[PDB]
Structure formats: C-alpha cells, structure tokens
Amino acid sequence: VNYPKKKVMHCGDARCNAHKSFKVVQYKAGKARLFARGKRRYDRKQSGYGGQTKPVFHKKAKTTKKIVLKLQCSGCKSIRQVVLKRTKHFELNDKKK
C-alpha cells in the first residue's frame, strides 16, 4: 500500500481547530526498558533456580501487523495516531500513479 507523505486533516488542538497539514511517520515500538516495572518483576522472578518461569510464545500465526501512522502537526508539534488495515508492504509515496 502506498500512502501519501502529507495529509490534510482536522487538528483538534485549540491553536488550530481546523484542517491542517500533517507529516506522516510510521510507528515503531520503542526499546523495552530494563527498569520498567514489569521487566523488574520478571527479572526478580527469573533469578535463582527453577528455569523459565513465564510462557514463551511460539505458535505465531499472523503474517502482517497493523500499520500505525503518527501525524505531526505543522504548528502544534503534537502527534496523532491512526490505524490502517493490515498489509504486507507499506511505503510512504508522494508520486501519485
């Protein structure tokens, strides 16, 4: 799926409250922090004898992921997140066919 690099869409913030030009960036998850609360609990549980204490998922079935696009306002600098349908090939394209 080809998606435009810019989108004219309504901005909810009080500064705009109107259709604005948003820059498009695909979402990528951040790195898991070592000192996150769940990660700290997991490491405490894992320490010592007893082997693996939590399930490790193996039976992967999905071949795709839902595309999340982060729209950054030109003036507001705030970001909105939208979800597209699952696809195998997502690219940001300006050249309209």
CA distance 6 to 20: 10
* Residues linked to residue 26 through DSSP beta bridges, in sequence order: 69
- Interface residues with RNA (CB under 7 A) are 1-4, 7-10, 12-15, 17-19, 27, 29-33, 35-39, 41-42, 51-66, 68, 70, 78-89, 93, 96-97
Pick one of 3, 9, 16, 25: the residue that binds Zn ion (CB under 5 A).
Answer: 16
Cα dist from 56 to 29, 35, 44, whole Å = 20, 21, 17
Compute the residue count for the chain: 97
Q: Which stretch binds Zn ion (CB under 5 A): 6-14, 39-47, 54-62, 86-94?
A: 6-14
Sequence ranges of the binding site for Zn(2+): 11, 13, 16, 20, 73, 76
